[model samples]
Target: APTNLEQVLAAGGNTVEMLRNSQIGAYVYPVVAPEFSNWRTEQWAWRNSAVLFDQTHHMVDLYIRGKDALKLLSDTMINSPKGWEPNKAKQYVPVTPYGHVIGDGIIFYLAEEEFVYVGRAPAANWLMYHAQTGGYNVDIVHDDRSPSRPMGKPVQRISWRFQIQGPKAWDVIEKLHGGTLEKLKFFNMAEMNIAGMKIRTLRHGMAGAPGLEIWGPYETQEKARNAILEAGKEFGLIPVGSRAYPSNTLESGWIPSPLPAIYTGDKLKAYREWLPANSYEASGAIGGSFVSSNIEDYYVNPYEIGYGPFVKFDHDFIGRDALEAIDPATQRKKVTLAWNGDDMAKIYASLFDTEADAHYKFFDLPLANYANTNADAVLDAAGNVVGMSMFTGYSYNEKRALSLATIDHEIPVGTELTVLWGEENGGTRKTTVEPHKQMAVRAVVSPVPYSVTAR
Candidate 1:
């Protein structure tokens, strides 16, 4: 009888319990090959040489246009619209009425009054909900992301996305252009030549290396990709596979996914009612050792996730009052957790025990996340919960397992902590999880970019 998220929540009872035990399984990168080469080689190529990442799938796109399009975004986002213009893009962040971060994405200003938001379903859903019901005179076109489990069904999109990254990225990019290309400012958009066609680019870089994120109409995706691959061959640009791709975030310190904080506000109840029962917010899963009956305990603010700089007060927006009242200095900060090598080895070695009570949670190589959202509990020396490790993975580039976490601001770099791995009560019912014991894996707080290994 429940037709929407609000009704579904009413029927399901506890929000955190429902999501923590949801059976949705892993958040997969669909359609793209899991690996073009071994994940290690594919990962190492990005740091040393160059790598091509096919981002055509996984993320949904929301195209917005019309007179009040900017107004709609300006009203809903924490980002300021003061100097945003055509051919510019920003990391768009939105929050719930209570100042908790709902989601973040890349919103590109294609032209005057026209914008496209490319990211996860959470942000796309937020944008669409407002554009439809906010009384703004704007038009919206939503393109669902490629199917998670297409099961042989043809999967496609209006456009294809790719990122050429790593140290030699510029070299490969220049070869494709048949000449030198000026590296523009970050997030600045421009056009470039590829295979006798013009392709739009967003100035992007990784690990101090200049790069470009390119995209075009789906009709020309193959033509553009083939040309880049052919040109990149001379620069040793390896095509990175999906398995290796997510691990890159571990080093870069971007928390790619955070639970959209929309489940418990009066101002947001209407939006929840508009969201369908099967919407990502309604059916998505959460897994980790941090368990609480209250869902708000899992919510995070923008400042906690390293988006403090983007929260401009020049313009009034939703959640402005709540955000303005909070003290930024006291908020937890983002950092990378360099998981202990000995503990990691013990975890993997447990898988071979074959006789132990049960092995620790299967640490899927290169990537170990098993749910749509991960919230493993991070504890300080005294065993107090100091933070949450949101994303976890093994990185061949770092030669160690790394996790992106938000810990107490006072916890300085090099401070040792432990992350509780595996779920409570012998794991959840999610298919991706196996019966296992928890491990308080030791880790050290490191800077977000993972600049240095702490001794």
Candidate 2:
């Protein structure tokens, strides 16, 4: 018998292993090529253009069915979702009593009374704590698994997530759906009955482009993989991997939750203890191992994740008091620095510029499925530590090395600043700072994936 994704991830891979390895799927696959040394970047590109990774392992199901489902979440999360009815899912960040981030995720109202929240990190405690702390009427549930719900097994160890983005991404989707696939939009998902098998297609935007994530059953996935690879050959949509996608996602200004700069060790332990173990165990024990059970304070409130407007603050929901007090105007918001392409090229080239042929510095790249601490201390020209850059990526579509940084209100967009990259290894080549420059404005710094055209 072969192993599951969790087993493989626990075994480790070509890149860094997951820190909070749990039901969000344990391991990401490897994408290799002749030129690239890191397969992580390659995996991201595969998901972006031609194949979709089996994030089913990353799939989390939280059942919140009751008269107070909406009330329960609104109180727990930062986003005010009074207008959200069933069948619709909205994204939100839950804040602490002190207005810091607890966790972030997507909420899907599967039915009038039932809902599920999906997150890269486990936050059942935050939700349940709010219920107990606030003394709400809702019967709190956790690690709630749908009995007999078929956990889709991987068809081949080689399964992939391929996406086609930009204005022309629809063209590729149309080809796969016999032209009907082109109908979906951002956050809009549809299940196509293809030759009797149900293939799920979802349209979501990333990297500031029109994007679509098509999930096919194993066989369909394999077929779709070949189809996309062949179709994308001519469009200049090169085969990319996780190594490259992070740069673009960062450039587009998407930040991963629980990332460093938010919180660390002991704080993480307390948050976990405060969360509900029911939800924590809900993902099911893969290979007899409990799936999720770690907590970290890198937790930030929704207002911190750049999702302030989406939160319905008026509702009588969990954490409402803290969110109500958040002075949105005064917070150090999330911003996108559309870096200069030419400047980026110079930086990449600098990796090999050192005369001794030493290892190039590694600025923490925000590969999907995991988080890293902020670069120890990246300072501005004034010598003040302005902001920490956690995830950096290259946007092939925009041809820029972009980043998602949480900066003070003082560092406005277009405010030219320098970046400290590389590493802090004892090696003489610890990370170093780059020059000052203007932040690129691909899209405004407002939250929520920047675009919800499909919604």
Candidate 3:
């Protein structure tokens, strides 16, 4: 009875079963009430009105401070921190020596030599291992935001994060902070006092619109959150649930969970040993139309997922040599696949038609889709596989079925392609999936940010 990831991986590699049994978000956070205020409306609120997402849970936070903090980060990350100062953040990507992305997350520089890496666990574990083994003069503090804390006396998180995003996000933030938030530049952090508590704000956008990521002490999270919600009432601010939150990646064009590069190589064997059996890597299911038994096939490069702009070669990082070898012009382009309405309707049609010739898998609206890594295969009109689709869902704001994919080659925006929806041989064993045949859904290549905003 292997309970941890290391043992589970070593036993029979039934990772899908482990993931199916445990819905990651179910254990991590509370789904916004009614479950039917519905992800679509919750999702639309972010694009049309404004939505407040409580990000205090369902995300791990790693705090690093001391003289060698920057050095350790520089050594492991693909993005350079050369000109980065306090009140700045970068999409920190640390890669394996072979150039595959280990993991990526938002790295915030709070103050002099103080930073917080917030995202998934792989990258944090990678850095934590190096910090101890590499003799870096840094103190590593980690707060696991999973359902249960380490020892369960209620360990406090380093900071509480809240995102207020959408078209009217600026209005809510400006009114709450009691200042003009328009002056805050993109990707820059600002400090403000709200609800009698000092807080840090980041000028960030999630739904391709102006937004703010506010953070403060865990103790005052409720007060600060209430203040923002109260101030946001005039602007139509609604609390976004986990279901709607995941769909935002489609519009923002972010690949949420690429298989961590730490799964391979002798160098990483020790790191794997350090991780627990119930870790994210062990519980994450890799499923979709692009079926592959080899775990390496699921891995993606930073460029493939649209992180090329952040990869700087100014300093020595873990995957610098490997990344430097890749020619920018030769890399695949990240594009959005607009799933055809007719085929999508057919997919839904199968759920009701008992006598249909070929039934399509059930797909829910606005956000209910795959629960794990969705690597649907993308094909050209010639029926040749040209790319792999990552995130797939319905954009309530756009009124279309869209997916974020990495094309084999750069093609015109209007070029037609086919996305094979549903797994082969009647789907995986995950509970979210139902028995169904696959369908070649029509798709058109579109720009990364599928819809343009006034920004």
Candidate 4:
């Protein structure tokens, strides 16, 4: 039996086939209830009023400490580490040696030689691999996300993370601070008072509204949450659940998942061998209509996924040479796909059609993504695949099915395109999908940040 990713790939016939049929199920938002006052109303509260997002779970946290901490990050990440100091955060992005994106995370510089990386597992895996193998003098610790199905097991974390966001988010934040709290630049770190206890803060906002992300000891979780809810009552603050939470990116334009580009590169073979067969890369499911025998077809670079501005040549990093050789102007740019409402109506209408031989794929409300890393075929007028739609969901605020995708640079906004929904020949074997036909959902290219406030 295969024990590592390399061995698993050797035994596995086709990577795409293995993933599409994977019974691993959907990428879960663990420990949080699916909804509060329903997903629809809870989603609306983020844009209209303030909403509390309990973010303590569903993300991997990696703590790096020691003299080589910054050196390790500078060598691996594409982001510039110059002038980086304590009380600052960067969207840390790393790529394979081939310059294809591996994964991304929010890395917070806590002190002179201490830092933490918070986000999905892909980037965390990448960082940990280098720290252990590269001989860097650093201490590493990982706290994996909460179990998808704990089955009532008491789960504990090192810290409690929360975000209060929306138009009235600041009003709620200020009330908790018990005075005016200055809004620092985005990603800047500081501290504020909550329930008479100090909490580390990172400046965050959405759709022209300001917010604060605070975290502290795990024991303070309920104390901080209760304080915010009580202070935010007059401001229409509500707690957003796991259901509508992932869908928020449709309006904000951040692609949370990209298939980590490490599967086939010779330079990454050793890393693959080091990875356990049951690891996320080996076990994660891929669901969508986009399928090819070559798994590289699904790979996306930082430029294509809207991380171009984060790349800098100022520092030597793993993928710097490869990225510099390519022309950013030629790479696909990220955009929003505003799905045609009439087409959406047709998709839902098929659900009621008993006379039909087969119905279109079930479009789950708010968020329709069923895979860890999603890639749907985005086609042009000639039916040629011009791009890959990455993350997908419907937004009640916009009243449309919006997707964040990377398309050919020349394809201007407002150009109508067709998105092939559902896997070819009656969907994949993933448990989240039912046996159904595909839908050619019509959509128009829109700006990356679909929300007017965000742009």
Best by TM-score: 1
Cα lDDT of model 2 overall? 0.46
Query: Which pairs of residues have clashing backbones in candidate 1?
Result: none
lDDT per residue for candidate 2 within 295-356, as digits (tens), equals 23233456554777766756655456766777887776676544454555554565565564
In candidate 2, how many clashes are counted? 58
The worst-scoring run of ten residues by lDDT in candidate 4 lies at: 446-455
**Cα-based lDDT for every prediction:** 0.91, 0.46, 0.78, 0.91
Candidate 3, residue 409: lDDT: 68
Per-residue lDDT of model 4, residues 386-455, tens digit only: 9999888899888889999999999988889999988888888898889899988888999978943221
Evaluate residue 338 in candidate 3 and report its C-alpha lDDT on the 0 to 100 scale: 86
Ranking of models by lDDT: 4, 1, 3, 2
Candidate 2 at residue 428, lDDT? 22
| Steric clash pairs (candidate 3) | 4-277, 5-277
Q: Model 3: per-residue lDDT, tens digit, 1-455?
A: 77655666688554444443444432223322324367878887887899898788767799999999989998998887788899888888999888988888888998988999998777887888899888999998999764532343444576788988888988887788788755477889987667666688888886557888888878887799789889998999988876677677888888776768666677667777777776777665655787555667767889988899989989999878989999878777898888888888888878788676667877765554565456788988788888888777888888889888999766778888999888777766666677889889989988888863221
TM-scores of the candidates are 0.99, 0.62, 0.90, 0.98
lDDT of 4: 0.91
Compared with the true structure, model 1 gives a TM-score of 0.99
Could you tell me how far off, in angstroms, the CA of residue 230 lies in candidate 3 after the best superposition?
Answer: 1.5
Q: What stretches of model 4 exceed 4 Å from their correct place?
A: 452-455
